[PDB]
Amino acid sequence: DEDETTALVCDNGSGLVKAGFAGDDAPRAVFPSIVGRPRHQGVMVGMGQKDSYVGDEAQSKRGILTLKYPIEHGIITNWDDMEKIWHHTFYNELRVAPEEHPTLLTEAPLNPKANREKMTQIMFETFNVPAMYVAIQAVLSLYASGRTTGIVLDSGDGVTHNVPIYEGYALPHAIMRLDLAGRDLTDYLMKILTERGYSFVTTAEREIVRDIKEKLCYVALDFENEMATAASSSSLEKSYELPDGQVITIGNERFRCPETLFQPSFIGMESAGIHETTYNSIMKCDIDIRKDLYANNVMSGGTTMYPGIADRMQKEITALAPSTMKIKIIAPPERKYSVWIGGSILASLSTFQQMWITKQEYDEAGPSIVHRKCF
Amino acid sequence: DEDETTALVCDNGSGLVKAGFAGDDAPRAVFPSIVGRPRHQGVMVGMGQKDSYVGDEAQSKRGILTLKYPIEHGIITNWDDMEKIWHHTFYNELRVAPEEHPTLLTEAPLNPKANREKMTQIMFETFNVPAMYVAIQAVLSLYASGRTTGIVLDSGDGVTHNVPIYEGYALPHAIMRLDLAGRDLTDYLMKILTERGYSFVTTAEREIVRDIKEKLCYVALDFENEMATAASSSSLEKSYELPDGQVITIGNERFRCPETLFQPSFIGMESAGIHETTYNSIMKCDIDIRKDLYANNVMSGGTTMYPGIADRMQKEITALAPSTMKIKIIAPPERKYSVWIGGSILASLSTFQQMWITKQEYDEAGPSIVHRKCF
Amino acid sequence: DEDETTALVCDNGSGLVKAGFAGDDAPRAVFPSIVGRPRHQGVMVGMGQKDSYVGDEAQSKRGILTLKYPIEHGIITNWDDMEKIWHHTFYNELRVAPEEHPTLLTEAPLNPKANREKMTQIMFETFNVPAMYVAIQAVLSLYASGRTTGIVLDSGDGVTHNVPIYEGYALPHAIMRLDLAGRDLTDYLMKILTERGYSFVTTAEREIVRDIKEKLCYVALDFENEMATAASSSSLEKSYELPDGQVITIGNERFRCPETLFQPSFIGMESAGIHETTYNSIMKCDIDIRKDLYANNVMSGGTTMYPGIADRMQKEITALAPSTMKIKIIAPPERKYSVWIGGSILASLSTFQQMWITKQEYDEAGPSIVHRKCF
Amino acid sequence: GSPAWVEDVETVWIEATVVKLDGDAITARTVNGDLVEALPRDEGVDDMTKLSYLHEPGVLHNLYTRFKHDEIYTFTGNILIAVNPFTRLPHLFNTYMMKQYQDAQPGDLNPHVYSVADAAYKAMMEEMKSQAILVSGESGAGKTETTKQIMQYLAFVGGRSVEQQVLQSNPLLEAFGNAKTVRNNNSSRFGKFVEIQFNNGKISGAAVRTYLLERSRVTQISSPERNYHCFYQLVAGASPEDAERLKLGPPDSFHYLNQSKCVEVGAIDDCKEYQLTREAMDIVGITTEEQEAIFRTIAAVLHLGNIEFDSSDASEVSTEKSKFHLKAAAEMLMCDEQMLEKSLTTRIMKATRTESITKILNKSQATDNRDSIAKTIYAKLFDWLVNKVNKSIGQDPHSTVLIGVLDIYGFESFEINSFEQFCINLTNEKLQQHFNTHVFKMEQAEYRKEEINWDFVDNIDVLDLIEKKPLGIIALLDEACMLPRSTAESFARKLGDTFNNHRRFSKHKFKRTAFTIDHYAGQVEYRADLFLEKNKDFVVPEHQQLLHASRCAFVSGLFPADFMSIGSQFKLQLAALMETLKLTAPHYIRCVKPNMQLKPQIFENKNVLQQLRCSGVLEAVRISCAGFPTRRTFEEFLDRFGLLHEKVACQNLLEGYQIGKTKVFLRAGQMAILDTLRSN
Ligand SMILES: Nc1ncnc2c1ncn2[C@@H]1O[C@H](COP(=O)(O)OP(=O)(O)O)[C@@H](O)[C@H]1O
Ligand SMILES: Nc1ncnc2c1ncn2[C@@H]1O[C@H](COP(=O)(O)OP(=O)(O)O)[C@@H](O)[C@H]1O
Ligand SMILES: Nc1ncnc2c1ncn2[C@@H]1O[C@H](COP(=O)(O)OP(=O)(O)O)[C@@H](O)[C@H]1O
Ligand SMILES: [Mg+2]
Ligand SMILES: [Mg+2]
């Protein structure tokens, strides 16, 4: 366990679950959240073959396993899965008896109430945690970057949200939420690589496609002369190696796969795109406090790591927003670990001590108290 | 009988029946499986002359006997023959009352169900064995070589199969089976030696031809400069002695007789050949797990003992498969006794104790239970 | 040639190539698409023996020919083959000089772009067709059945696709494509008949297996009491005659061979099966237009002719979909000739006259214009 | 209510008799003073069998009292118990004390063990020929001096120098055997046995049955007990010219002897000890050529430990870079270099009827083959020394009556319970099972003697879950040892996933791999380190042929007569030793020790509690209290009834008592309840 009764901070966030003790500056446990099942008949005896594979063992044997992503779009689908993944993160990675430290979990905004009610119920009644608290993934990014106050434009593999935070207060009348996330870029890439001739259908290929998206994708400055010029010459075409030893060439689809985050008509959703989401989020605040947000709008979340996101977002705001207005985008380079670093501070480095949910209050109140306390 | 109630392991495998107790490292009984009948009239009294010759007495008197191979291409033809050969292997070689030890028999993959149903029926109802089990000749080669996981490329005198095994699981959607086996190389050699001038028609000659195939055959590296160069000089031509005292010279047919295992158009079957069988077997697995199989594809079975099989197979994969890919062929030199050595472990050295077919279940279920249990 | 300059409509579709003039209600030329090669040595002089057999002569001599299916899974493999089959369909069946009429070809959705670029290139540059157009095999089924608007659930020997079409518009964000097609049912049947004891390995047997699949297969209502009850009595067992004069009995494999289209775990692919493919295709459309598709989902393609497909699909949707919802499956009985009948109308009976690719535009643009025009 | 014991940190049961407090809130004063708010009632003594309370408080109080009374107080219990006083025994091992032990039957048998030795000698004289006495005691309990005093008492009794020869033989045995364990820098060697054959009372024959050697100490070692004392003595360099004649390098040079940084030890002068061992071998009668051959054999074992193995398909063959250690090993063993290399890398024994195949084994197999050759060689070396030991000992002229003595390593703890320690725990478990069976037989004899109808197996359950089943833990370990690529953690997962419930044993905490098992001496969690690498063993025939036919004559005599699981052969050998011990009449003796100060008038209640737990003295007390612990005569019960408030009158005043023939076989808790009724 731990050499101190400091609390435990872990984001589950539907992608790569991040976990570690409070008061650190580095997360001590990171793995891709995934639940594996053997799909084929076994004949060889004695190599374990246990029907519950999870995490970093799961990407090792990922050729003969089905894949089950447990958390989708910010909603939790199957509770046996999260019951499994909590137990695996606690007992195998940080080897911690969970009844020694309180915990801090998180969510996106606007998630359904039964989900938070289940999550609050489970750690108390199955793990007997002393205390629990739920934070907001919009908030802690600012405690990560230091208190600059503004728009937190964070998009992970689950969702995308737009929360303005001013001066110590949040604005619940004008937050936003979209579903173009990491998964939809994967699934657009699946239909996109099929144009070249390649073909991927099964879910074991999904984490391979995720790798190519993680490497060879960059957000073009213009979306017309790029898609004309790379169609005019192969200067953009690079290569990659599938784990068999093949060589796959990539055309203009290095940029068209995250292009649709600024043009979400391609995948058939109807919405604004994330830049107009940011702008319409700002226009629903007051005319008094506006000009801070234009200079203190902060990115976060691992889907915003494509090399060109900053200049593209800046040019799009500058064309969109009123003219004589200084616009300034922070893009801190630990952003893929931003949120947990936020959970680094807020658990340990505050007066956050009576603000915990004492389990006594849970035994007196039931689950729904986590509605009326933590936000 | 035995000094211990350990089970009994015997492969019948249509060629040389291998038999012995579990827990040993050496098979205690080996003979060519063959059933002999006298074909000519007897006049001399009192020298036995019993009309059921079998096995190692059978190759002694093999001039005036018909030959009846009982098991063909993995299928059992006549059940009186196998009823004979089981009784001869039990009572004469290992002198064992069969109702003291369970038994382990085997098969190739994809053999017809009535065959396994007959074999399961006979030992229980005629010999009253306590327990029975059927294994797969694809599997136990890995327990022979130690658990390397890969393609088991095994070809005996019966069949040739290609089973991939990964990590504790087998892949039944992409196994293979061909019929180019030991017998077809004999029968190609029969039509091949007739080109030189020699002539063999009767079945007593068959085991003589089998001997020359067992000795003077080697798999050429190239199949063109060899067949041009040995046609240019007699450096390859060697000699052999038929049991009369004659001397027979062999031309380029030292290599052309197993050449057709990589070119099976000669004998008029239509198929790929065994190397393209291996490659097409691998390509019907996932792109995730491939690169293990290229380095852990394991030969077996006594037809793969021709001096040159390893380098030829390696060069053929390397030309065939994608390029930057390490390919590695294990060729363990006890391979002609591989399968039984596999049956050495799996009977005795496991938790393989409730996995036996208790004869009680046979009396309650009938034969078809051996369908639903052992694979 | 023709008594009118109406265009020419032919689907190639990897199976039985259908061809005929526009404006008719009956296809005038139908043959199994296959390319034949002699594999054995000829000695008899003067019986033609030409090394390019194709089509209906090819199923006549199919004992001593290799078989080469030219088009696989919707992709075209060898272009000499399609160069052959186009020339044979034009010059021998409809005896038409191809430079007199425009042509209409087709595809599945999501086929690789180089394929359509090759097909567009070849008729223009080798046959000098006046005009060309490529349609979608999802579309024309509705013009066949009359404009009911819905899911086109069509599966030929190439592929299976699920396209929703509403009200005059298609939904490219939620089409589907699977590869369980006619060929995979043949290849499951090949491994299935081997359980009974029969044995088929060579490619000349493939068209014989195709016949038995075309005759004695029917989709069971339940998949458990059928596979228990036919295992309890031989009421389902029928007989068939191989062209030698043998009699082969068929067990429960009349229904298990197309059972796997609703359970595609058997052949080791990982997917949903076609009914859940249809349901997941519908759930990715809007909540506004849904209830039309439940009552206007239309089958097509010759793999959906097994006697029981309609009730099975209906019961599966009704268990799957939300309850109080009228579900209605059209199953028009010319469905095996549906697509070409669709090509009957759309070429001749529209304003489809400037929508053709004038060959002038091809000489000014190159092949890639067939990307930007026809869809 | 006030007179009781009190559990505390230092005084684990302090007999605190102050105030009758509440039932669980027990607030009173104590010997240390006033305490806060449940230990049992409290009431130097020779036997506590008639005590009012049979508890660890009264037992520890009598122990500390007899430590203060300087008496080695041996309770009768069908088993005695003494303490190492770390002082001289005047008039206790004396001949007049021996004459009194030969004379005084009932009186002197209380604290004295030579009187118990005389009683055992009389029982052997009472036609109970097959008889032996168990000697419970740890490292430093004085059991060797106790056995010497018992041999002196037997020589005074039986008459008929074997003791001096036994004294001279222990230096040769312990040097070949002992190392620097966590409990002793001069540890034990192994299980040792002795048998004195009597020629109708004339004790004349010497025999030994020392088995169950520490074979795992050859290559696997992880603590200061790596260097054997013979191995360290040869590493000490008992001859400088013969070092160059044997090419013997430094103590750090041998990689097999490079385990856990205990090269220099502040416990032994191994050069002078090696000279003393050579003198003792000459006293046993070892030839100088025999001594040179033994030294050359140990040197060859060291060079073979230094013989590195290496990795075309390189994973089936080896190489040679520091081939000097290989060539020196070939020279010191007097065999061909290429022949020994082929016997290493080949393992070629696969023959069918006339064919022969050469299975060129892998590098991980090759290192195990080297380890197997070494473990064969050293075991043969210990066996030849045992043969010479039994030769120089000399037995009797086909005598039929012998008396046995046994000294084996018992239950122990460490920082981690290794598979060697696990096997030692299994040995102590089987020994405790036999001792508990003897105690239960004595209890049933005492019940049938007083005609008491008095109506353990979980130890047999622990033995079953460890070894005895066909799906046992030793069996599963052997099973996973065979099938390759068996990960250690994967072994642990099945280990905790088979027999998961239903034991005094389960899986570890939130840790990597350990298996917690509650043996009779308490709960130990053996940490699942490379037991799967330790228990591997192999015996091939061609290595036996190379050992038999090599040019070294003594080495040829060490393997002249030329299944694969160390747990399997250990189970067979331990079962054989238990079956051999089963044929004799049992006695038991417990040697306590004041190991705190290693001096007189000192006590370590933690170490004494560990001694009573490991030897099962507390467990024997529990098994004794399980039956009818209180047993007082009808006059004794009448006196107790008169003190409280004639057997019928006592039954009327009282109404688990069961009046037997003349005693009242009752419970000690009933005796404490009667004492509370007498006090109230
Ligand atoms: N090049 C890249 N570097 C880092 N992350 C990337 C990259 N490309 C895509 N990603 C996405 O970033 C995500 C990182 O996890 P994320 O969803 O940001 O966690 P959270 O949900 O807690 O915000 C992954 O889902 C991955 O899809
Ligand atoms: N040189 C050779 N050495 C060993 N076996 C050979 C040789 N040449 C051919 N063989 C073939 O190897 C076969 C050995 O038996 P095999 O069929 O492998 O047993 P199984 O059917 O159990 O695999 C024999 O049929 C024999 O035809
Ligand atoms: N009983 C049957 N009747 C008609 N067609 C059948 C039957 N059984 C199977 N089929 C399949 O229907 C297919 C008809 O051609 P199809 O592939 O539908 O053309 P297209 O590819 O244009 O849709 C053949 O491949 C054949 O395998
Ligand atoms: Mg995440
Ligand atoms: Mg055989």
Ligand SMILES: [Mg+2]
């Ligand atoms: Mg077709």
